[PDB]
Swiss-Prot record, chain A:
Transmembrane spans: none
Protein name: General transcription factor IIE subunit 1
Zinc finger regions, C4-type: 105-133
Domain HTH TFE/IIEalpha-type: 4-80
Record's function text: Recruits TFIIH to the initiation complex and stimulates the RNA polymerase II C-terminal domain kinase and DNA-dependent ATPase activities of TFIIH. Both TFIIH and TFIIE are required for promoter clearance by RNA polymerase.
Subunit relationships: Tetramer of two alpha and two beta chains. Interacts with TAF6/TAFII80. Interacts with ATF7IP. Interacts with SND1. Part of TBP-based Pol II pre-initiation complex (PIC), in which Pol II core assembles with general transcription factors and other specific initiation factors including GTF2E1, GTF2E2, GTF2F1, GTF2F2, TCEA1, ERCC2, ERCC3, GTF2H2, GTF2H3, GTF2H4, GTF2H5, GTF2A1, GTF2A2, GTF2B and TBP; this large multi-subunit PIC complex mediates DNA unwinding and targets Pol II core to the transcription start site where the first phosphodiester bond forms.
Gene (UniProt): GTF2E1
Similarity comment: family membership: Belongs to the TFIIE alpha subunit family.
UniProtKB/Swiss-Prot annotation, chain C:
Chief localisation class: nucleus
Gene: GTF2E2
Stretch of the intact protein here: 68 to 239 of 291
Record's disease association: Trichothiodystrophy 6, non-photosensitive: A form of trichothiodystrophy, a disease characterized by sulfur-deficient brittle hair and multisystem variable abnormalities. The spectrum of clinical features varies from mild disease with only hair involvement to severe disease with cutaneous, neurologic and profound developmental defects. Ichthyosis, intellectual and developmental disabilities, decreased fertility, abnormal characteristics at birth, ocular abnormalities, short stature, and infections are common manifestations.
DNA-binding positions: 1-79
A biological process term (GO) from this entry: transcription initiation at RNA polymerase II promoter
Protein name: Transcription initiation factor IIE subunit beta
Organism field: Homo sapiens
Tree of life domain: Eukaryota
């Protein structure tokens, strides 16, 4: 109801660009908002109004309900799907993998795993060195890290969640209304 | 195509670039199917 | 060509002169004789002046006359150039269908008004490049956050189904 509408308004404002979010300001009052009525409600640009309606038809916000006058009502579960997708993205950012094992040959640009070290290393001088490249090997250490980037990407998605906490609470209130 | 989809995609362009990609992939499989213009190397040189 | 009095488009010049003073910012109700004096077409002859009142003034669809003196007809509202923030406050009115042709001339150049508007909460977006202007406020509630466009790009399932079921299975 009003909870779902307010929830949607928050996400679609911070989602679609100012011009498309303006379309969704009149689509928040999902009623007989036909393209004809929206040429006096949004006063957009006819063909361009229809173009951005197709940009909001990827989520079918107003369900393009063919009613000639057309009546649009928001019964789509896409808004719930999109916030859940954001939560899935935070988990994906957390799982970006970790440095694993590496000693890298700077000159030939080949990277070697630790088990490979038992062959990479030099027996006589005990100095790790390359195989196809014969130049002295350099331990990756900081070079080629998948752990620092993974943590940073996870933090950025997590930073969105306190701002998104109000939207999550609105979704919870809407869920209580449904049940 | 990836850069556009990743950054500021108009989407009208996306429909067309799909055609370029589809055309190019087909050309690897065969250079002269019905319709399907023969992609050329230089000055009318049908790609092997 | 029906009936034409004296020079062609004398009424069009009269309309332009009425428009010029309003854009200048000097606004006064003007009788048909007064506008003719301003255009210097006042000595158009008695029959031609009668023709303008009987046909040319009647022909205009939006022509408005308060009583003795005619009043601005293309825009019924005065071009105040002020209270734009108040016009935005009523979102349903949405600036009372403000038009770019009405603007850039109400009493100042639009670019000067746009600089004032940018500082103010008012935001200007033009779906038609020159035909019309729209005034709206998105507020500070909307958040750019991180890779928002990429996140929308990732969710392109659209008609595809069972994606929600996968999310529900993770939720369980
Ligand atoms: Zn090497």
């Amino acid at each position: 109801p009003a909870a779902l509408k307010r929830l949607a308004k928050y996400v679609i404002r911070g989602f679609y660009g100012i011009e498309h979010a303006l379309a969704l300001d009149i689509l928040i009052r999902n009623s007989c908002v036909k393209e004809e009525d929206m040429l006096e409600l949004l006063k957009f640009d006819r063909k361009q109004l229809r173009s951005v309606l197709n940009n909001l038809k990827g989520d079918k916000f107003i369900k393009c309900r063919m009613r000639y006058f057309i009546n649009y009502r928001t019964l789509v579960n896409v808004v719930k799907y999109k916030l859940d997708h954001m939560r899935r993205r935070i988990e994906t950012d957390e799982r970006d993998s970790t440095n694993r094992a590496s000693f890298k040959c700077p000159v030939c640009s080949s990277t070697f795993t630790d088990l490979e070290a038992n062959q990479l290393f030099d027996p006589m001088t005990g100095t790790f060195r390359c195989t196809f490249c014969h130049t002295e090997v350099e331990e990756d250490e900081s070079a080629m890290p998948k752990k620092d980037a993974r943590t940073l990407l996870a933090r950025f998605n997590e930073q969105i969640e306190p701002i998104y906490a109000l939207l999550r609470e609105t979704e919870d209130v809407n869920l209580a209304y449904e049940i | 195509l990836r850069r556009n989809e990743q950054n500021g995609a108009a989407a009208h362009v996306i429909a067309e670039d799909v055609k370029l990609l589809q055309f190019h992939v087909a050309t690897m499989v065969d250079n002269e199917l019905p319709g399907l213009p023969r992609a050329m190397q230089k000055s009318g040189r049908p790609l092997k | 060509s029906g009936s034409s009095g004296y020079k062609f488009g004398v009424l069009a010049k009269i309309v332009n002169y009425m428009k010029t003073r309003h854009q200048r910012g000097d606004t006064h109700p003007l009788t048909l004789d007064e506008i003719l004096d301003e255009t210097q077409h006042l000595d158009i002859g008695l029959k031609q002046k009668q023709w303008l009142m009987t046909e040319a003034l009647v022909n205009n669809p939006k022509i408005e006359v308060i009583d003795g003196k005619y009043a601005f007809k293309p825009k019924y509202n005065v071009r105040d150039k002020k209270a734009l923030l108040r016009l935005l406050d009523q979102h349903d009115q949405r600036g009372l269908g403000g038009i770019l042709l009405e603007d850039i001339e109400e009493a100042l150049p639009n670019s000067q008004k746009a600089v004032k508007a940018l500082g103010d909460q008012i935001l200007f977006v033009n779906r038609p490049d020159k035909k019309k202007i729209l005034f709206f406020n998105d507020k500070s509630c909307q958040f750019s956050v991180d890779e928002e466009f990429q996140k929308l790009w990732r969710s392109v399932t659209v008609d595809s189904m069972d994606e929600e079921k996968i999310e529900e299975y993770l939720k369980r």
